[model samples]
Target chain A: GVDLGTENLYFQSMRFHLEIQEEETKCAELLRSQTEKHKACSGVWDNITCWRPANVGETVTVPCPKVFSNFYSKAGNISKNCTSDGWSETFPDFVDACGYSDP
Target chain B: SSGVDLGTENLYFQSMRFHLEIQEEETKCAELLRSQTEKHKACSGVWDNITCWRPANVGETVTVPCPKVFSNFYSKAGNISKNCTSDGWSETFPDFVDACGYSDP
Candidate 1:
């Protein structure tokens, strides 16, 4: 992924793997199933601050969370809160759905 | 009348329980109940989909949303429903608990 910050260098790599190590066959099978089940709704995500994609004609969809949240640490303490309505539909052409919690 | 859903990952339920323990977190049950209440409250007026920003500052107090507005105000009712639901579950409660609370018997 390319970092938009001018001070940061762009990074592009092809190797990033996750693995599970288990001693028992059932344990291994369970891990495998867990991994697979997790994928039912598992994936990387990005905050497309621009709800609209770069290309106009291109179709796009995203988690249009009316509220945006950020995990933070302050004074050696962890905190989280939703920044109210941090987003809006950038383009009228895009289809918006309320899948904020669809599995 | 308030009960918890022990229906998901430990982390999910724990998180909700924790938040509520710390503060009067709005639960998913609360959200569902709120919606029913809002639907009933609509008998008094013709609500329109929010055409205005309401608040100059987006953060402070913005009017609900725009999609759910329609003739006779049904869409507006839905929009209010959506906005209220999100705001309710997200912080006070969260998706996990909300889903669990909404689970069909």
Candidate 2:
């Protein structure tokens, strides 16, 4: 049986991700306008995951949040690679890395 | 210059503000829904003029108690539910919108 409470939580998490996506787009645009080369990627919150500023050519990682408890277990970390251009456009395999958990 | 009916003007302004609030909420909810991916899509919460609904997963039905607004004229003991289909919310708005036996005094 599906729990509406848990489903609502999932919905909220998804909404948060959407917000982060918007913010990420704005951050990327700002980064692109910068005149300096080899600058660090600015810290960003992608709703589910947060990343601190990372030096160019560095990779940053953080544990997957528990908000997606319905979708994944509690033992995986997601990462982002920073390049001179900016942060990676595609998200890491955060969902795949965590695997599925029993509801 | 003609005399202004301050009481009527005030009521008109209040009505306009109320409708504006509804429009703003609808736009905000639409943006939230638009941002969702197909695999994880869900209906966003909205203000239906009388009450606010919580977000629900696709294919889920959400129920809320009738609001107590204008309690003296409306029945607030019943429940109102709406479906969240994959395409979006169902066409049927809550029946409770007309449950009032008398107009607001």
Candidate 3:
């Protein structure tokens, strides 16, 4: 039983790592395709949230990742402000917006 | 047996918790953007995605402070000015459209 449980934990950890890796790759691709020469914040992936580049003084909104769908409710989308200097330094307010749903 | 069961359950819980946090942040960020959009529309203000201009009568010239970030790097003196023409808002004068400086070094 212990051996089986250990194997399950390893697989679960691997799954989580892969999902994050995939999201990071997608974000990188999105950032690379931007060709605008205007003054804007650079896109960034802050571990959990993937933010796209936005014009200065603009607020950008994005939906939750699909990986969370099975375990959480999509309460709403997340948003970040692009200041004149750069992207907002702190994480957005809705970091806990998703409610848990027991499977 | 009990210890192994607990460890597996803990791992699953941690994974779900991570997902939950990410979803929550996304939702909150979206709500903030929606509210900002509504406010901008309410005042008939224009958001050019780069700057938010206050409502002004047609044929009037509006002066706004240069973005703080721009001022820090460029030699900006007074407020930047734009004309509200019959067509729409004219491009900003001293033309910092692409950047605060005349050209990228």
Regions of candidate 1 where Cα sits further than 4 Å from its true position = A1-41, A44-103, B1-19, B22-25, B42-105
Chain B: TM-scores of all predictions: 0.17, 0.49, 0.43
Backbone clashes in model 1, listed as residue pairs: B68-B75, B68-B76, B69-B75, B69-B76
Q: How well is candidate 2 docked (DockQ)?
A: 0.01
Candidates' TM-scores?
A: 0.17, 0.32, 0.39
> DockQ of each candidate's interface versus the true one?
0.01, 0.01, 0.02
After superposition, which runs of candidate 3 have C-alpha atoms over 4 Å from their true positions? A1-9, A35-38, A70-74, A89-94, A100-103, B1-105
Task: Report the C-alpha lDDT of model 2 over A1-103, residue by residue, as the tens digit.
Answer: 1222223323432453455456567666666665355457876655245566678888877666544445665577777889988887424455455663323
Q: Against the true structure, whose lDDT is highest? A: 3
| Cα lDDT of model 3 by residue, B37-85, tens digit | 3243222334331234455557777666555433445543545666676
Q: Candidate 2, residues B78-101: lDDT per residue as tens digits?
A: 566788988787744545544333
What TM value does model 2 have?
0.32
Instruction: Write model 1 residue lDDT over A1-103, tens digit each, in one string.
Output: 1122221111101001000111123334544555534322222213322222122233334433222111111111111122232323333321223222222
CA error at residue B41 for candidate 3, angstroms: 46
Better of 1 and 3 by TM-score: 3
